[PDB]
Amino acid sequence: PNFSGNWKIIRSENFEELLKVLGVNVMLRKIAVAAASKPAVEIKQEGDTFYIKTSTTVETTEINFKVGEEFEEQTVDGRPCKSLVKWESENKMVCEQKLLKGEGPKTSWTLELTNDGELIETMTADDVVCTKVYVRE
């Protein structure tokens, strides 16, 4: 299972609603779900080591991490966090996040690859789950 590729979003379920519950205002939510904020995800995997670059029309960000090694990123609502990814299976990674400052919803994310080559992303905050699906260019 190789996650590498240039991934384009084809499905998105419950993302705006998941920002809504988190206090993100209507203006920012509508920007986030707008066509222009659609995420192009570039992944390069080398064994347990990942590079993931996320670009929209106005933003670009990169993370580098190795499965099993703590790193810092941001929660979906931008709050800095310490993250740790584990393999749940050969085709599925799971990440637990802990805030660097203050308190908040318990947040996590997962990425998994289907046999048909789709990339499924979930993001969770407490009891709310968002699912996005991507396909390779």
UniProtKB/Swiss-Prot annotation:
The protein's PTM annotation reads: Sumoylated in response to retinoic acid binding, sumoylation is critical for dissociation from ER and subsequent nuclear translocation.
This entry's comment on induction and repression of expression is: By retinoic acid.
The Gene Ontology CC terms held by the record are: cytoplasm; cytosol; endoplasmic reticulum; extracellular exosome; nucleoplasm; nucleus
- Highest taxon in the source lineage: Eukaryota
Listed binding positions for all-trans-retinoate are K132, V133, Y134
**Gene3D superfamilies assigned to the protein according to its UniProt record, in alphabetical order:** 2.40.128.20
The listed location of motif Nuclear localization signal is: 20-30
Provide the GO biological process annotations: embryonic forelimb morphogenesis; epidermis development; fatty acid transport; positive regulation of collateral sprouting; regulation of DNA-templated transcription; retinoic acid metabolic process; signal transduction
Altering K30A: what's the impact? Loss of ligand-induced nuclear import
Protein family per UniProt:
Belongs to the calycin superfamily. Fatty-acid binding protein (FABP) family.
* Quaternary structure (record): Interacts with RXR and RARA. Interacts with importin alpha.
Its recorded name reads: Cellular retinoic acid-binding protein 2
Species name: Homo sapiens
The opening ranks of the lineage are: Eukaryota, Metazoa, Chordata, Craniata, Vertebrata
- Gene assigned in the entry: CRABP2
